[PDB]
């Protein structure tokens, strides 16, 4: 920080400043001391621990009655507005839809609402399954998730 | 009228009209206190006694508040040695009002 | 009823205004203006033009007459000070502060 060839301490023997270099963290602007650190301390997770936490939460999503497993909400057309009249008719709104079929007419529908949402089952994680009011899935996702969990 | 009595395990001097605080009782607010452990009555009066549980002589009172106190703090400290520590306590109480004194 | 006259950024310090201020403190308008003119300090002329604005704006549009008003408040606060470095013996590069005052007179019927 804009000096090394200059000390603010230059024969101290009077009552003076404690800093003694111009880049000190106790300078008004100087680069502070406990900085340039990582934003979490380590990241790996044991495979058996990761895959077994997903078993645990998955049993609980059935213990809380969030699952009833409904394949194909899709219609003739990728419009959201058609899917959402489909979801109202099945009486399950505000649900986490998991596709295992990657059908563009379902993925590109059911998304124009802040709690109506569709995702793909790819790169599963314990934090995804817990979001939104319930998780409905398709039976195509239940196959394709169960093999990442076993 | 002034009086001394023994209650709880202290002896206490008191006047008439006086609201005083004492050690906790079971008696609820709005129900009589009466003291037969009165040791003398003295208000210009010559008297014999220093005796407890005396019969004819009573101090009649009443409960006026049963409560729990506002948080006091106690600070424990010694200079020069970097020693400072703090505690709180409330203590429960009864206020009684003296509407008695007989001899 | 009540009127402020100020003079802000004025050439006094508050040590210099307070000498005049305690003589005229809560003292009625007409008597204080007699006491003030028999003080030949520089602060005492300053406060004169500012008392005269105080009394005169009250006789219209908030009130009427000037004799019946009294100086309810008389006060001084630190205005923005200009800093200069003074050249001075032996190479001394000392601070001088050029003080100003913000002077408030308040008159009301009271």
């Amino acid at each position: 920080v804009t000096g090394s060839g200059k000390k603010p301490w230059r024969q101290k023997g009077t009552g003076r400043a404690r800093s003694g270099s111009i880049k000190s963290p106790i300078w008004r602007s100087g680069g502070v001391t406990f900085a340039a650190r990582p934003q979490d301390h380590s990241q790996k997770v044991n495979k058996k621990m990761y895959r077994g936490a997903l078993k645990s939460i998955l049993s609980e999503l059935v213990r809380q009655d969030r699952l009833i497993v409904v394949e194909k909400f899709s219609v003739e057309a990728p419009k959201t507005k058609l899917l959402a009249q489909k979801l109202k008719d099945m009486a399950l709104e505000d649900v986490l839809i998991i596709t295992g079929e990657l059908d563009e007419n379902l993925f590109l529908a059911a998304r124009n609402l802040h709690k109506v949402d569709v995702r793909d089952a790819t790169g599963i994680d314990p934090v995804s399954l817990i979001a939104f009011d319930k998780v409905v899935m398709t039976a195509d996702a239940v196959k394709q998730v169960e093999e990442m969990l076993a | 009228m002034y009086a001394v009595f023994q209650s709880g395990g202290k002896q206490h001097r008191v006047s008439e009209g006086q609201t005083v605080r004492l050690e906790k009782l079971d008696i609820a607010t709005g129900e009589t206190v009466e003291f037969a452990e009165v040791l003398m009555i003295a208000n210009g009066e010559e008297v014999k006694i220093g005796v407890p549980f005396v019969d004819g002589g009573v101090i009649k009172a009443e409960v006026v508040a049963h409560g729990r106190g506002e948080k006091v703090k106690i600070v424990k400290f010694r200079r020069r040695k970097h020693y400072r520590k703090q505690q709180g306590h409330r203590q429960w109480f009864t206020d009684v009002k003296i509407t008695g004194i007989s001899a | 009823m009540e009127t402020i006259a100020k003079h802000r950024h004025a050439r006094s310090s508050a040590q210099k205004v307070r000498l005049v201020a305690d003589l005229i403190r809560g003292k009625k308008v007409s008597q204080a203006l007699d006491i003030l003119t028999y003080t030949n300090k520089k602060a005492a002329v300053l406060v004169k033009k500012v008392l005269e604005s105080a009394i005169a704006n009250a006789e219209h549009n908030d009130g009427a007459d000037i004799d019946d008003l009294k100086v309810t408040k008389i006060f001084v606060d630190e205005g923005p000070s200009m800093k200069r470095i003074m050249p001075r013996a032996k190479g001394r590069a000392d601070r001088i502060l050029k003080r100003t005052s913000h002077i408030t007179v308040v008159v009301s019927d009271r």
Partner: protein
């Protein structure tokens, strides 16, 4: 000498209490003019006991 602490604002008020300059009392009239003056002294621009005063 120097000091040992920062002083009080009660002191600052105390040291200037017995210094502030005096005045005459009461709004004057004069025997020979409607002019106010400083009492027992010449009216600055009018008559006080005959004559006027002051220039420049």
């Amino acid at each position: 000498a120097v000091q040992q602490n920062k002083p009080t604002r009660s002191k600052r008020g105390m040291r200037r209490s017995h210094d502030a300059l005096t005045a005459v009392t009461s709004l004057s009239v004069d025997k020979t003019s409607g002019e106010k003056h400083l009492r027992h002294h010449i009216t600055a621009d009018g008559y006080y006991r005959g004559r006027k005063v002051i220039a420049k």
